[PDB]
């Protein structure tokens, strides 16, 4: 019917590859790989990708390609008792569009400020830097006070963030203007890129998702020439077979592969809903998983050879400088590293452009997925003015993200990252996989997969669809639900009330699923057996 397909198959492939990659393949994978096992981390990562990420990825991709509906309108034809998946996914996408875009705003501010022969973090001879200055080493004579900070750390904590004026999480300090202008610009770009649909989203992804790879290759070629750039490569490739015995390494690998491939979310499904019918969605899923793994691998290479160059110029044992867990690894350490190299300006520009284009495509994909979901759900009041209500959802994300644009917004973005995403999306994906496999029927799903492309998958894919991925997801949820994380940021410890607030925001999306199972039987009442058999049966087109 009116299914607006892509220009070419390579267009959808590039769009989904862009949705796959993000900052999390640069700031998270190398750090987690170094912490959990070192060089030997590749084995559990690849195992949990083969068993945990690729199966759910391909399952939801083929499901959305077959049924041709959004992540909310598909439950009418899959399992009407679980229509709250769409609403929970919209809530999670709102939380992400709120917190994640602040990283893009910071990167854009860094970019627009880096247009100077003297980088703003190569010397602290500025107004914001205080007497606690200790410039880059350049020698080993200088001693370091316990409170002494590098010029890039000072620039990141006082000027681009303005976090020194945060006297407590109970208040915010005030919304800054520079970060607000950068986020206004980036949201305007998002709105002018996702207004029409996949037709122009695919045209902008052609330069949005391909630009990170050329910058990554340039940075890798640079890292292949830096002095002492082999120490970091050796730390990245030094295996530790003893660390693999621990279960925390496997938990970290599973969490990383899940939040890198992003399976069972509702963007792959919304994209495949616009894909062709007889298209080979198996090869696409395979090549996307492979290219995401290879992108994470190359990003680990480049990041750790940069840290190795730093540990050669500075003191070695990169773990001494790689203490910041989060985006600070790209904002503090990498800034120092680029500042020490000659002609730092060009490399700063290309690196921050790589960050901003790694964020752009991911935000495009998420917002396009949620927009396609809400459009497929209400195609009468909406879908007549598609370019409308997109400005409305953009202003909604802006109003949700203004709380992160304050002076102490780093605490807010960390709280939203580590609490508003994990358990909610994991339980959502788990019960979605149960609905598609157990409730909807694994045999029926395999029959639809066979009829769609022309051949049914093997018994191994069925095992991964019915038992392996469910146990994987439930293992992750029971691991994350049994260890309340006392996370901190810049020595700002989070009290227990912050943990309660994070837990409340976390469940603020899952409860929408019981909402529908509660307020759906009010129109189809009756006995218990008739209701339990009417909730499971799908729609009859």
């Amino acid at each position: 019917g009116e299914r607006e397909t892509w220009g070419k198959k390579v267009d959808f492939l590039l769009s989904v590859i862009g949705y796959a990659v993000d900052l999390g393949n640069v700031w998270r994978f190398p750090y987690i790989c170094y912490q959990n096992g070192g060089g030997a981390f590749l084995l559990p990562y690849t195992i949990m990708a083969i068993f945990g990420g690729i199966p759910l990825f391909y399952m939801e991709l083929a499901l959305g390609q077959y049924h041709r509906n959004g992540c909310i309108s598909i439950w009418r034809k899959i399992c009407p008792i679980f229509k709250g998946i769409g609403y929970a996914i919209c809530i999670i996408a709102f939380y992400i569009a709120s917190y994640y875009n602040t990283i893009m705003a910071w990167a854009l501010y860094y970019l627009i400020s880096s247009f100077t022969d003297q980088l703003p973090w190569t010397s602290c001879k500025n107004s914001w830097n205080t007497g606690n200055c200790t410039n880059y080493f350049s020698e080993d004579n200088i001693t370091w006070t316990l409170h002494s900070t590098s010029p890039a750390e000072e620039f990141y904590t006082r000027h681009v963030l303005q976090i020194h004026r945060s006297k407590g999480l109970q208040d915010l300090g005030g919304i800054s203007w520079q970060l607000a202008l950068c986020i206004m610009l980036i949201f305007t770009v998002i709105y002018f890129s996702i207004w029409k649909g996949v037709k122009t989203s695919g045209k902008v992804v052609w330069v949005t998702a391909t630009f990170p790879y050329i910058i990554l290759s340039v940075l890798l070629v640079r890292g292949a020439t830096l002095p002492g750039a082999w120490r970091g490569v050796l730390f990245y490739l030094k295996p530790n077979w003893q660390k693999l015995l621990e279960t925390g390494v496997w938990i970290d690998a599973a969490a990383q592969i899940f939040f890198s491939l992003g399976p069972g979310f509702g963007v792959l499904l919304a994209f495949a809903s616009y894909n062709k019918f007889n298209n080979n969605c198996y090869q696409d899923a395979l090549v996307t998983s492979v290219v995401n793994c290879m992108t994470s691998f190359v990003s680990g290479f480049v990041i750790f050879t940069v840290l190795g160059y730093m540990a050669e110029m500075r003191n070695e044992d990169v773990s001494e400088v790689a203490k910041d867990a989060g985006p600070s690894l790209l904002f503090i350490t990498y800034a120092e590293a680029i500042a020490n190299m000659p002609a730092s300006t060009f490399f700063a520009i290309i690196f921050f452009l790589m960050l901003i284009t790694l964020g752009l495509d991911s935000t495009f994909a998420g917002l396009e997925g949620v927009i396609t979901a809400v459009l497929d759900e209400f195609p009468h009041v909406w879908a007549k003015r598609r370019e409308r209500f997109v400005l409305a959802v953009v202003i909604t994300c802006f109003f949700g993200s203004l709380v992160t644009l304050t002076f102490g917004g780093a605490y807010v973005v960390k709280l939203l990252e580590e609490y508003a995403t994990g358990p909610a999306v994991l339980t959502v994906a788990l019960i979605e996989a149960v609905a598609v496999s157990w409730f909807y029927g694994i045999t029926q799903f395999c029959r639809d997969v066979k009829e769609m492309l022309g051949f049914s998958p093997g018994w191994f894919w069925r095992i991964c669809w019915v038992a392996i991925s469910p146990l994987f997801l439930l293992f992750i949820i029971c691991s994350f639900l049994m260890s309340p994380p006392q996370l901190r940021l810049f020595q700002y410890n989070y009290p227990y009330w912050s943990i309660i607030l994070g837990y409340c925001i976390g469940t603020s999306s899952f409860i929408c699923i019981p909402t529908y199972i509660a307020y759906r039987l009010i129109i189809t009442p009756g006995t218990f057996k008739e209701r339990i058999i009417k909730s499971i049966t799908p729609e009859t087109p």
Partner: antibody
Amino acid sequence: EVQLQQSGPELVKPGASVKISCKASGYTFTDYYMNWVKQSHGKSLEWIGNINPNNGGTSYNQKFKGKATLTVDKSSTTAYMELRSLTSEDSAVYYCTRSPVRPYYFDYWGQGTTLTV
Amino acid sequence: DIVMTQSHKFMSTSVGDRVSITCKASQDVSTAVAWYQQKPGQSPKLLIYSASYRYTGVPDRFTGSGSGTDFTFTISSVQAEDLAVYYCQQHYSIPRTFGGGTKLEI
């Protein structure tokens, strides 16, 4: 000019425990790491662990994971390290010393007390 | 761990000669090596850190160099008050560790 006080020796019986203090006099208490290090009778030095006086953080050795635990107090200007599971092989002189952040050299040491069994 | 191996615990010479000791590292260490002086009975005394920079309160007699794995701690014209068990400590990685040292004869 800068002295590092310490506790006194004690004939500790096998099974009991003992803690040793330290006083950073001459330089500020909360601007450099207060490391601890051990050496047996006529043997080599063995690092015990690191402590952060500003936030009470610590980073102990892998040979003293549960064997030793350290605490600090910037109000009383002390460094209380707790030693448990004492024996004869682990009973010798201990040292308290200062160290800045990431040149990691031990500038000034205490007078040195021996925890003999 | 990163074991700190040095010369023999007795390799030394008489008074007024060129004393040179080495400190081999299991892992390649660029400059993260220090040198402490253990006078008989007392605490170790820091002399040189980063393998090429003598800490304050030092006579010009103490010297030292080296990089990668072998660090050359050289000193000539030794006096009667500079004979002590010189330990070799590294700044490389946690858990940090010291060396063995060497007695001075004669």
